[PDB]
Amino acid sequence: IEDHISFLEKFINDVNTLTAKLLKDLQTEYGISAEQSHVLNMLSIEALTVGQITEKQGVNKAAVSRRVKKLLNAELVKLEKIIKLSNKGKKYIKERKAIMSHIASDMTSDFDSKEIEKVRQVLEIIDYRIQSYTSKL
Amino acid sequence: VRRIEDHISFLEKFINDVNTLTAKLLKDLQTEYGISAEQSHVLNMLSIEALTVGQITEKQGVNKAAVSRRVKKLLNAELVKLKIIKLSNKGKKYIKERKAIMSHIASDMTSDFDSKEIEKVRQVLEIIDYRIQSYTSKL
Ligand SMILES: O=C(O)c1ccccc1O
Ligand SMILES: O=C(O)c1ccccc1O
Ligand SMILES: O=C(O)c1ccccc1O
Numbered sequence: 001i002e003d004h005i006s007f008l009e010k011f012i013n014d015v016n017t018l019t020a021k022l023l024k025d026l027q028t029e030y031g032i033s034a035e036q037s038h039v040l041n042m043l044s045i046e047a048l049t050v051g052q053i054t055e056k057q058g059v060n061k062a063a064v065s066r067r068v069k070k071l072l073n074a075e076l077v078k079l080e081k082i083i084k085l086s087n088k089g090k091k092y093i094k095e096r097k098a099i100m101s102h103i104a105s106d107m108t109s110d111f112d113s114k115e116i117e118k119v120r121q122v123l124e125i126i127d128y129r130i131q132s133y134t135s136k137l
Numbered sequence: 138v139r140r141i142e143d144h145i146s147f148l149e150k151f152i153n154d155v156n157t158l159t160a161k162l163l164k165d166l167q168t169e170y171g172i173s174a175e176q177s178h179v180l181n182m183l184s185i186e187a188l189t190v191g192q193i194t195e196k197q198g199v200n201k202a203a204v205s206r207r208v209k210k211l212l213n214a215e216l217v218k219l220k221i222i223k224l225s226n227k228g229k230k231y232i233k234e235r236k237a238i239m240s241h242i243a244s245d246m247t248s249d250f251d252s253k254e255i256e257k258v259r260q261v262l263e264i265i266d267y268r269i270q271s272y273t274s275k276l
């Protein structure tokens with residue numbers, strides 16, 4: 001019970017740690033931090049307002065506005081307030097994906113996609129539930 | 138041809154949501170112990186196995202200025218007993234409470250799944266974690 005949660009946390013830190021490493025060059029080449037990168041990542045799924053990003057990240061709305069403002073000054077993001085990636089933000093995400101995809105696909109090339117979709121399903125239901133507790137108090 | 142990007146995205150959205158929920162569930166407790174979430178993360182590490190500033194900076198990742206300064210503020214708050222580094226009564230107490238809360242919720246969100254379903258999820262995550270390590274050690 002406790003070891004599962006403990007495992008998930010080591011798993012989360014290891015994923016984040018490898019990602020930070022795999023993406024550091026790219027981020028510096030663009031002059032952005034990991035948090036701005038992470039917002040760029042959220043926006044590649046779809047355009048969002050500062051409010052939705054706040055909800056997703058869980059932080060203070062102004063810490064998000066701060067990242068977004070830096071992103072606009074860097075022109076990696078454009079307005080209408082609906083935020084969406086700009087052409088520069090799009091190039092960034094394509095390189096981020098190219099990188100992340102390369103490693104992931106090599107790392108999972110032997111996975112049985114029939115077995116895996118059952119795992120994805122359990123994780124989608126868990127994510128659903130996570131977002132709901134979050135939704136409330 | 139390349140839907141892997143969608144799986145990675147999901148995994149990232151999932152990790153993101155777990156962090157968001159964890160921070161919210163643990164904010165009041167971290168406050169009662171007069172510590173922040175970043176300090177909480179670090180204490181979560183030492184409950185695993187006692188360590189030093191070398192190991193910590195690596196696993197942590199990019200930390201080259203105020204990561205050693207967060208170690209300091211732990212001693213002052215009496216959460217790290219020392220070479221080695223262990224949790225103090227205060228430090229172990231916090232982590233115990235932290236585990237309680239996390240487990241209660243991890244149990245509720247999971248009790249209806251079948252053990253077979255969960256064990257297979259654990260197996261996939263474990264091997265991804267094994268390969269991440271068997272990776273984040275080469276270069
Ligand atoms: O059982 C687990 O360790 C586990 C870990 C992460 C996500 C779902 C899970 O069942
Ligand atoms: O870094 C770890 O080994 C770790 C382990 C469990 C929970 C959080 C963590 O950062
Ligand atoms: O840029 C990201 O989306 C990111 C995610 C996890 C860890 C480090 C990072 O830069």
Ligand SMILES: O=C(O)c1ccccc1O
Binds near residue numbers: 034038059063
């Ligand atoms: O840590 C934050 O305040 C933050 C804010 C926006 C996006 C990613 C983040 O980590």
Ligand SMILES: O=C(O)c1ccccc1O
Binds near residue numbers: 110111112113116261
């Ligand atoms: O069936 C798979 O592809 C699989 C992959 C990793 C771990 C356990 C598994 O069954």
Ligand SMILES: O=C(O)c1ccccc1O
Binds near residue numbers: 116120147261
């Ligand atoms: O997308 C998946 O099927 C998946 C499965 C296990 C772990 C992370 C994942 O994204």
Ligand SMILES: O=C(O)c1ccccc1O
Binds near residue numbers: 042045056057151
């Ligand atoms: O939508 C999110 O909250 C999200 C978070 C992390 C990575 C990709 C994402 O779409």
Ligand SMILES: O=C(O)c1ccccc1O
Binds near residue numbers: 156
């Ligand atoms: O406080 C923690 O140990 C923690 C861990 C993961 C995500 C957010 C957090 O606050």
Ligand SMILES: C[As](C)(=O)[O-]
Binds near residue numbers: 035066
């Ligand atoms: C941590 As930043 C450079 O996105 O304000």
